[PDB]
Write a protein that binds this ligand. Sequence first.
Ligand SMILES: [Mg+2]
Length: 192
Amino acid sequence: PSQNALYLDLLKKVLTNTIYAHTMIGLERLDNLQHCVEAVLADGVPGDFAETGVWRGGACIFMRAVLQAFGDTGRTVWVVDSFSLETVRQNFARYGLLDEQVRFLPGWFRDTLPTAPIQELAVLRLDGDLYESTMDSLRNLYPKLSPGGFVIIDDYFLPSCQDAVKGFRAELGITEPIHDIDGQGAYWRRSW
Ligand SMILES: [Mg+2]
C-alpha cells in the first residue's frame, strides 16, 4: 500500500531543483532511499533514520517526508554533520517539516557519534567521501541498525570509499550482499 505517491514524486522533483538545490544525489538515489524507507515501514523494522554528511539536508528532508506520507509519527530523522545549521533547519521549514520528528547533531563526527543519543536505526545513510567519516559513522551507528534495516553509502563506488566499506565489513564479518543503485551509490540490508 503506497500512500501519497504523487506527493513524494513531486518532492523528489523539487529537492533536485528540476522545477525552477537542496540535494545533489539525483533522482535514482532518491528513488532508492524511498524504497528503503517504505520497506522498513511496510516490514515493521523498528528504529530511527540517520544521515551523516547531509549537505543542504535534502535527503533527510525527503526521509522526513516519507514518514509524513505514511502517517508515521514515532520515528525520528537524525541529521548528523558539521555545518549553515540554521540554513538546513530553514530548508526543512520551507516544506513544513521542521518539527519534533527531526533532530540535529552538530559537531565533529569525532566527538558526537561516539555518544550519540540514538538507540536504534532502521536506515543509516552516509555520504562517504572520506575514510575517517565513513568509519566513524559505520563503527558507531551500524550496531544500532535493526535486523532488516538498510545501510546506504552514497559514494560507494569511489574506489577509496569502496576499500573503506569493505574493510569495515571484514572487521565485523558482514557478508550481506551489496547492491548497486546507479553505478555511484550502493546499499545493503542487514539480515533478519
Ligand atoms: Mg555523496
